[PDB]
Design an enzyme around this catalytic site. Structure first.
Site, PDB file in Angstrom:
ATOM      1  CB  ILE A  14       6.588 -22.697  54.556  1.00 40.08           C
ATOM      2  CG1 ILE A  14       5.099 -22.538  55.010  1.00 40.08           C
ATOM      3  CG2 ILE A  14       6.724 -22.902  53.011  1.00 40.08           C
ATOM      4  CD1 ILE A  14       4.340 -21.370  54.544  1.00 40.08           C
ATOM      5  N   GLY A  20      -0.337 -29.593  63.221  1.00 40.08           N
ATOM      6  CA  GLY A  20       0.346 -30.179  62.075  1.00 40.08           C
ATOM      7  C   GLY A  20       1.217 -29.191  61.323  1.00 40.08           C
ATOM      8  CD  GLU A  21       4.019 -31.516  57.385  1.00 45.68           C
ATOM      9  OE1 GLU A  21       3.440 -31.525  56.275  1.00 45.68           O
ATOM     10  OE2 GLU A  21       4.793 -32.422  57.767  1.00 45.68           O
ATOM     11  CG  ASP A 128       3.950 -16.974  70.802  1.00 43.73           C
ATOM     12  OD1 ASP A 128       5.061 -16.698  71.337  1.00 43.73           O
ATOM     13  OD2 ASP A 128       3.780 -17.957  70.047  1.00 43.73           O
ATOM     14  NE  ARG A 132       9.506 -16.686  68.902  1.00 41.17           N
ATOM     15  CZ  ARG A 132       8.426 -16.940  69.629  1.00 41.17           C
ATOM     16  NH1 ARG A 132       7.456 -17.706  69.144  1.00 41.17           N
ATOM     17  NH2 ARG A 132       8.311 -16.442  70.851  1.00 41.17           N
ATOM     18  CG  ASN A 133       4.944 -16.014  66.334  1.00 38.69           C
ATOM     19  OD1 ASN A 133       5.132 -17.015  65.625  1.00 38.69           O
ATOM     20  ND2 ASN A 133       5.049 -16.058  67.658  1.00 38.69           N
ATOM     21  CG  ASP A 146       0.584 -18.812  65.971  1.00 34.84           C
ATOM     22  OD1 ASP A 146      -0.544 -19.274  66.257  1.00 34.84           O
ATOM     23  OD2 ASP A 146       1.639 -19.451  66.133  1.00 34.84           O
TER      24      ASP A 146
END
Length: 253
Positions: A14, A20-21, A128, A132-133, A146
């Protein structure tokens, strides 16, 4: 909390993170988001990746992404968090353009402001903060996740002076992103154009149909003097007043 891997199933990628992912997954039943740690890494790097889970583990708030636990006795090493069906707020709004009322958008900003007020109270500077977060669940609940020139306060770009007051600046940009249905802050201006615009004392205009009082609160967030900016509890109070008096939100420029 250690989660036995036999209770975990991994699904579709996603997103991507620093180690990593980020994957959709299942925990047994509920949906979870999974951050995997694969390939080579030292103990210090493994502890660094896992420090995000201990940080999240210290937080308990309706607008802060919930931790389920970690997988550490097997490979891959994983951090499991609650799954947020609607994903990132900026893309969710762009897709669902004009689908939410002014009051629903204010509720989203109130949630985010409450999550940020909690973080600030915990002496936690996000650095941040951007739409988007912010993650959105099935019930439209907005959560800070995040644990970016256009979103960053001038003093934080210029001197790396990151404070809860510099997160307030970011929050004001979040406000503009929400009220504009996920439009890019400062449109297709280059980062140097944005810095140049801020130096000219230019500030983002009210998005179409945005109540004047919400745009004023954005301007409050964008004071050049970080000490002139409202603090997170003051932002929550302003939004709560707008919520108590919805007729005041009908005043638009």
């Amino acid at each position: 909390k250690e989660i036995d891997v036999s209770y975990v199933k991994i699904e579709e990628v996603i997103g991507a993170g620093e180690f990593g992912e980020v994957c959709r997954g299942r925990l047994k039943e509920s949906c979870v988001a999974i951050k995997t740690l694969k390939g080579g890494y030292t103990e210090r790097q493994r502890r660094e990746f896992l420090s995000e889970a201990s940080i999240m583990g210290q937080f308990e708030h309706p607008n802060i992404i919930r931790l389920e636990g970690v997988v550490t006795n097997s490979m891959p090493v994983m951090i499991l968090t609650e799954f947020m069906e609607n994903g990132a707020l900026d893309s969710f709004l762009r897709l669902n353009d004009g689908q939410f009322t002014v009051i629903q958008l204010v509720g989203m900003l109130r949630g985010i402001a409450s999550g940020m007020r909690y973080l600030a109270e915990m002496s936690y500077v996000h650095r941040d903060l951007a739409a988007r977060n912010i993650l959105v669940n099935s019930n439209l609940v907005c959560k800070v996740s995040d644990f970016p020139i256009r979103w960053t306060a001038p003093e934080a770009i210029a001197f790396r002076k990151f404070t809860s007051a510099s997160d307030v600046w970011s929050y004001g940009i979040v406000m503009w992103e929400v009220m504009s249905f996920g439009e890019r802050p400062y449109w297709d201006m280059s980062n140097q154009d944005v810095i140049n615009a801020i130096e000219q004392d230019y500030r983002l205009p009210p998005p179409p149909d945005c109540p004047t009082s919400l745009h004023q609160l954005m301007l409050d967030c964008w004071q050049k003097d970080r000490n002139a900016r409202p603090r997170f509890p003051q932002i929550v109070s302003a939004l709560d007043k707008m919520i108590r008096n919805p007729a005041s939100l009908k005043i638009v420029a």
